[PDB]
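DM between two lab members

TW: hey, do you still have the Alpha-conotoxin BuIA entry open?
JB: yeah, one sec
JB: this one, 13 aa:
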Amino acid sequence: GCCSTPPCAVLYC
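TW: and the structure you got?
JB:
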């Protein structure tokens, strides 16, 4: 997806 790669705030993007 989008923020599938850390360290994002919404990993479940």
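TW: got it. The chain is about 0% helix and 0% strand. Residues 2 and 12 are 8 Å apart (CA to CA).
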